[PDB]
Design a protein around this ligand. Structure first.
Ligand code: NA
Ligand code: NA
Ligand code: NA
Ligand code: NA
Lengths: 90, 90, 90, 90
């Protein structure tokens, strides 16, 4: 499960990285950062400058937020929880 | 269900698009983008400049966030999940 | 229930409005808008300029987000849902 | 439970405060504020300026959001709820 969500999230981020680096002309690292803060709703970034960027962002958000949060919902509950939980055992 | 939420979300976005393009004077595409990042809480945009814009945004958020997230909660769980889940079957 | 959450949310917003209008020197409407986008995590606004503003925002977020979202979780599910749901009955 | 989440959240914020104050060169209070609005997805702040800041933010978000929201989910439901709920008793 966690393995799958990880894959789906990575592919989603890869797509955003390629899109933004090409259409908005961002360096790869900035394109990945934009993709990440967008899908997690953190939004610490100015908006895309092109209409293509805006249209894609709208669609990217609706399709990717569900996935990204489903993944985060497992990263801390199915992997990060026990580590400290089972560790909460005397 | 998914069909209904889709309709309710579209109408909500249409209302925001009309509102912002008129009161804040944004081009339709920018008004739709503002509406979308606002309701998904992504917030990658500067705030409205008019008091009408601010008041409407406050009300728009409280009434639309619940709907938009309910829709997203189905777009990936009732439509996007199986596609890859049922596809996870050897 | 909905009545109570409404009260708790209003008081929370009133507190933020008073705080920001005084410490950050914002007009009441802008102080309320800042309070609202902050607690809903929309964040369509520049950050507070004073250390008092920042410290208060940190505490305001942790204490108010839970409440605000609990309220929204009822505004659309206990009030906005039926209106269109019961209306989905032929 | 609430005691534990409080500890995990504090350590997470301490790490972010140290990181941002050092790499992005922010005063401690601004580093803590950035860490807080980032992990709660409020995002009321400009993005990091360095690639290290961006890479760390990406990882910080994925690992810390789950924790921070789990904590908030208890701060208002296991501590803030009764206070006013049990108080809702005539
Ligand atoms: Na958010
Ligand atoms: Na945000
Ligand atoms: Na934001
Ligand atoms: Na923002």
């Amino acid at each position: 499960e966690f393995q799958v969500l990880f894959v789906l999230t990575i592919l989603t981020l890869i797509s955003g990285t390629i899109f933004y680096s090409t259409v908005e002309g961002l360096r790869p690292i900035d394109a990945l950062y934009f993709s990440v803060v967008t899908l997690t709703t953190v939004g610490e970034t100015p908006p895309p400058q092109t209409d293509f960027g805006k249209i894609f962002t709208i669609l990217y958000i609706f399709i990717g937020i569900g996935l990204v949060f489903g993944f985060i919902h497992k990263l801390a509950v199915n992997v990060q929880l026990p580590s400290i939980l089972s560790n909460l055992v005397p």
